[PDB]
DNA sequence: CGGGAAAATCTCTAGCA
DNA sequence: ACTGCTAGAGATTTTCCCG
DNA sequence: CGGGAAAATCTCTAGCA
DNA sequence: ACTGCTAGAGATTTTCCCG
């Protein structure tokens, strides 16, 4: 039940940006989505990223490669 | 209290100082002689 | 420095020397010279060297009117994906901008439109078109196209494509539609190797799927967490770290000094 | 890797599609595709439909995504080939349009529409369009008073149909349905691309005869030999291109 | 790929898809898609992303004419130091540009002047003024102010200073001279913490001193070096490394496999 | 042999291909239809 | 004689730039000057720098500090 | 550090200036300055001169650097205060001008020239100018035929005088001389700045009484106590500001 | 050797029009 | 065969200064 | 573990007007 | 209370592939 939902929400990749870095950071792992903030995991680090700074996808290219 | 010198709109003359009312990421809201203006942070200095 | 400072202001009142010059010529600490320069109104002539970061929410669209061959092309773009919509219109008028906006809001979920302060976008007819479609209007700081960087950059790619296909069409509207097609479905790259159409499909599909999944997770996973405080609502747990929402404030705490009830 | 046999058994029992198997057992989609393709007892999203409606003396030109009920419509000044080709080129630029169904009318069999189909890569072939006509006219009749011209009414009607009326098994609107179906098509195209890429590779493991390649993992290499899928270590198999 | 390539050129002839799109849609290696895009004339629309580097020899000066309050200000700059000379002139004419150039060449050692292709700089009267003073003329690539970056940047600092002191002078020529003074002697910073005047003095004084010193060293230190070749002329030795000049080609060789005679 | 596509002077239309005659640091000399031109390397592509 | 001249020519500082780096490199030590090329020593490394890329000085601020 | 005694002996023998000592023995210039300042038996570049010459009916206004013979001259339309102040402000912007000598003429004692001197920081005081007048007129008479106006001739004359005629002990031209003298002045100003900075610091070493500070090295601290200069390790002395 | 403060270095931007 | 740069504002790293 | 080649990442620029 | 960005060209670092 719940565990399948959690490992499904964690399959989505997140590209984000910090408040002073113009470059987009690589695909993170979505842990929690909210109305104004998303909780991600980039390289064994948990960051909180506002909704206006994040692009969440799923990469269908990758879901099909592995 | 902060002094703000800014460059408002299609005008090369810098104006100021104005009161700082709100500092955001990339833009700031000031008050220059009972006139509220929004100026990006590329066009303002805060002291 | 009382003798060295008084001479520095007297020299600055004439030449407006920077802090380095007044520190070298009057034996001043850098803080004192910087203070003297910072109190001079005539020397505050430069802003800070950064850039802002535009909104890239899934519902954010940027619109702008661009000109080519004497015709007006109204261009829209989905900021999160780069998917563009465009249309040659006979006049920069609130009527046809509202028509374009209603068409766009009918084809895609448009939550907020970001535009500059052109007369066509600030018109009372667009306001009614945004109010009926439930769209929120976010106008930029006047005379700052950087606030519309996504669409302004899209005004360049679209023009660049039109010149590549301008000899395959008699009229400019046909070339504009060819360019929209080419950008949206024949140019790959970006944050997924996608094209603009594939990418936009990914953003909305992901938005709905994640909203439903998180709704289910929050419906099932219902815990309260005490750390160090009040019963913060649990958001996520695992890998020796806990993420919670205490009074509408998301913070990350380690598994230690945190109990889940 | 370890659940290939469980997947094979579940398919021989329930005849499940590869998507569930890749989701339930955590298998690369290529392997599940080969599971469903190994049994002979187990064997649309680019299809738009075009028609022209008359209302209040102007010609409305409607486009319907059959799989989803999503409607693209706008009022055109004349029932001519110029405007039909313009509309269809616009549509091909917005959504991936692969084949359009028409009623062999004069404006649909012109040379301009045919050239627009050739350029956009659309196939032309000459009852959902009638029901969608009826529903769109119903909604226009509802919402007409809220506008002065008819084009604006039509667009408000298209917005209402696409995003405000919901139904079906899950209660989704036409916009969500179209997004979902196009995303599934993207998944299918990517899977076909990857299968086509791997199909020109032969694997020699432990040496044994050549075998078809399915997956190239970080700790294993999945191969199909004599209609049987086996797992071998990367160091125990050499992959060549033919 | 014979079937996959032939369809890719046919699709590129219509949409001009980039290498990524043609690699994903037709199963092509990146090199093949890049080759197909590279053979299309209509797709070569972007130059390479770098910048050049202007000449900063001690004898290099950059001149340009700038406008302010309807008057013409002829500005010069010493590239190596940033020391500027300026003058309000009634007209952009080769006569007064030649006058300014002769004055400049009489006050400082000017070996070469770099200018854009304005009519006043490309005039036959300036050519005579440069020929008499032994100055070499280096014109930039037309319509590329980047080739004059030093002076163009100096057109901005000079204007910025003039506005700071414009209310201390009735006429604009007085303000221009005040600005020249302020830039040259009241603004410190740069590659030595200097001002522009101090820095320029350092460059010419260093040039003469080093020329004399190296003349003496070459007059005394006279050796020939064989390495790995011919008798290369010795330039410097020490710290386990030898620098020599073999047939007008300076190269650095280690002390090993090198003998000094 | 190299093909050079360039942007010569106050003109947004790109021209080419032209023969490469001299590649310097920052600028290049080409030959386009018996016409010798000097174009910076920001305004040229070489293949 | 010659040694004094050599350690005098080595007292001059050189700021230089590489053919693709827009930033000026710190003060090196002048070893040899020529009409078109200067030989310097930056951080125990011997580089050859053209005359048009180098700005040789002496820093009178420093000669007087030490 | 080690040659302070050798420097002191060489000065008590030959009365050498601090520059040679800092160059010959490798001493920080402050220490050599204190050596030359410790003996009581051992005890211009901003000085320009201004005059006006008449030739062919126009007024030439000449400026001479006394220390170097470097000439700044140009033809002005009228012998007035406006133009004199403009010329002097120009000169003050080009070179460091600290005091100007004049012949108390009407155009030199105006209010405009005085205000220009006040703004530029120049001191006003009311036979080298006459000899330079004669030489400049000589050169103008040589070179007049090569020009049509007189201003151009004057400028060519100034160029020839400043950079083509050489003489003196070393055979240098006026331009090289001015550069050298201004560089020596820069050295002197920097040394004075550093001495003024260090003079407000007191050192307690090994504790002994306070001493004047001279140098703050990377392996030593040089101090002067009771008219005697001693070297102490940095860890063996504490520096305080007074 | 250890923090804190001050200095030096780094990064980045407008305007030159 | 020729060529972006300069100075200031804020951030971040180094160095020094006394323990 | 060791090179080489190919892929991925990084850096940087015009144009949007 | 709001906000530069995008895609391509060349350079440099990573990853993989067979020994
Ligand atoms: C009359 C409306 C309202 C009032 O302002 C004007 C002027 N303007 C100027 C540009 C322009 O030159 N952009 C180049 C650019 C520069 C910097 C940046 F960050 C982004 C950029 F796109 C436009 O594109 C544009 O649409 C307008 C416009 O619409 N208006
Ligand atoms: C008629 C002459 C000869 C033919 O060309 C024109 C046009 N032009 C244009 C600028 C200008 O817009 N500079 C801004 C800028 C942009 C980029 C850069 F790298 C450096 C920069 F300074 C000038 O300054 C200038 O002097 C001229 C000029 O003199 N002429
Ligand atoms: Mg110019
Ligand atoms: Zn000031
Ligand atoms: Zn092409």
Residue numbers in the entry:
A (entry chain C), G (entry chain I): 212 to 277
B (entry chain D), F (entry chain J): 222 to 268
C (entry chain A), E (entry chain G): 1 to 228, 236 to 268
D (entry chain B), H (entry chain H): 2 to 44, 57 to 139, 149 to 228, 235 to 270
Q: Which text from the study accompanies this structure?
A:
We began by analyzing the structures of the intasomes with single-residue substitutions, E138K, G140A, and Q148K. In the E138K_DTG structure, the ζ-nitrogen of K138 side chain approaches within ~3 Å of the backbone phosphate of the 5′-end of the vDNA, participating in a salt bridge with the phosphate. There are no other additional significant changes in the structure. This interaction stabilizes the position of the 5′-end of the vDNA and presumably the conformation of the active site, which explains its mild compensatory behavior observed in enzymology and virology assays. We also noted the compensatory behavior of E138K. By itself, this mutation has a minimal effect on integration, but when other changes are present, E138K consistently restores integration activity (e.g., compare Q148K with E138K/Q148K or G140A/Q148K with E138K/G140A/Q148K). A salt bridge between Lys138 and the vDNA phosphate backbone should help stabilize the position of the 5′-end of vDNA, especially when other DRMs are present.
HIV-1 and other retroviruses integrate a DNA copy of their viral RNA genome into the genome of the host cell, a process that is mediated by the virally encoded enzyme integrase (IN). Each step of DNA integration, up to formation of the integration intermediate, occurs within a series of stable nucleoprotein complexes (intasomes), involving a multimer of IN and a pair of viral DNA ends. INSTIs work by chelating the two Mg2+ ions, blocking the active site and inhibiting the strand transfer activity of IN.
